[PDB]
Symmetry: C3
Subunit: 160 residues, 3 copies
Amino acid sequence: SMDFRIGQGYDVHQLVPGRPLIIGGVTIPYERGLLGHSDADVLLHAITDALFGAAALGDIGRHFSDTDPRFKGADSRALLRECASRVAQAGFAIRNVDSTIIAQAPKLAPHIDAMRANIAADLDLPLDRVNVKAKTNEKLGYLGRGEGIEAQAAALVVRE
Amino acid sequence: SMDFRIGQGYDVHQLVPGRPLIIGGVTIPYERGLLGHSDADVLLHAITDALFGAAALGDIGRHFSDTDPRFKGADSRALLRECASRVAQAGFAIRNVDSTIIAQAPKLAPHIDAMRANIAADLDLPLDRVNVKAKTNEKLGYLGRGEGIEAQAAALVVRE
Amino acid sequence: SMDFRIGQGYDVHQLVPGRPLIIGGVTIPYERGLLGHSDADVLLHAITDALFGAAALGDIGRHFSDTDPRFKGADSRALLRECASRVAQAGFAIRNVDSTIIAQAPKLAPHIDAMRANIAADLDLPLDRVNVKAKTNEKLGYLGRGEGIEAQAAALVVRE
Ligand SMILES: CC(C)NC(=O)Nc1nnc(S(N)(=O)=O)s1
Ligand SMILES: CC(C)NC(=O)Nc1nnc(S(N)(=O)=O)s1
Ligand SMILES: CC(C)NC(=O)Nc1nnc(S(N)(=O)=O)s1
Ligand SMILES: [Zn+2]
Ligand SMILES: [Zn+2]
Ligand SMILES: [Zn+2]
């Protein structure tokens, strides 16, 4: 009941024209979107990595081919749910998730609660155990220039 | 007694002429200082965000910046104290904080213990539950060119 | 048995021709290697810092100076083992480590189990409490251009 473990995750994707902008499962109106083989949901990927890492199950690349042509455009919420299923199968219950999105644009405040609800649904958690934070990079670097979006995540689990 | 939660925080600010350099509440001699509407204490901001995240209370931007009369002109220590108040209000106790400052200059080593003492006082924690680390970015990127200073933080809390 | 603490770590080193590439104690064939005073093992440095952080013992630069004769010529595994000894003597047992390497190249997945094996040995941990993840920076910034490699780490300990 006290075999706790922590995990941490990081991800970044380029912002490009002609792609949907999907963050935290939310399709956000914007002239650009994130580039990747999947739907490129940088927030869900970072959380997925934190969960695999807390369970010592490797990482998102190990579990989900980023090159399989059948999976082009994959829904990263389906990947997050399969991650959670494998973490559970390994014997772990999720206690909480925290995360940060770093972007110059668009404004993410109107979308954060929806992201939180998506993640909570996918992890079978109440809202009070999931947190999504959003901020800019204060004009510095490629994030300041709006060339990509970063996400960070932390997860606490317990082996039952 | 076992409802633990983790949070993670990140912040960065530009280094600019004509501002005092204040990190972890410590005024450090230096020809530049951090830019922000606040006093731009990047370390206290990262710790603040980690604490809000561990309590699933959102983030520093949702708590502090509507030109709220109580917080205009507030320094980052007052805001850290208020964050800790709101964490307690939600029924959480803080168990520990860890953090890293990334800066090419100036030398922060002589100031680390004063930062730790300031954070401990603001969070009503013993010293042995607060840690601050500092390193350079090996001359890489905007941190490496001395254009900004980054802070990272992790916090463990428990819902009593 | 319930005095849990969390720590976090970060490191980066430049990647240029002329030095071997050593990560997690593994020598990896590559046309470039990491620059630093010791062996520049960016992954072990980040994990070392997360462990000192969780124990609130400061950081790797305060424990292992480049000037101290005791550690002249010590490689990063020797430093990691001494870190673990100090964490133990401060009264903490390590519960788990998670980490991420960010590099555009080479492919690190073939070397992950070797890194995990080295880390678990140095920390006297079962293999299923040590995790290493690896991903690219999607061609963004100095990491995306192959000009350096970053590592992030998270550690959970408990005071015994
Ligand atoms: C296309 C889907 C099924 N597979 C997928 O998305 N795999 C990934 N592997 N690493 C990633 S990362 N580095 O962007 O978090 S996403
Ligand atoms: C001036 C005070 C009252 N308000 C304030 O400091 N608000 C912030 N919002 N985000 C921040 S961050 N992203 O630089 O940590 S600081
Ligand atoms: C040369 C050995 C004995 N000492 C050593 O390597 N100390 C460090 N201090 N900071 C580091 S960092 N910033 O690259 O993680 S490594
Ligand atoms: Zn991704
Ligand atoms: Zn800030
Ligand atoms: Zn290093």
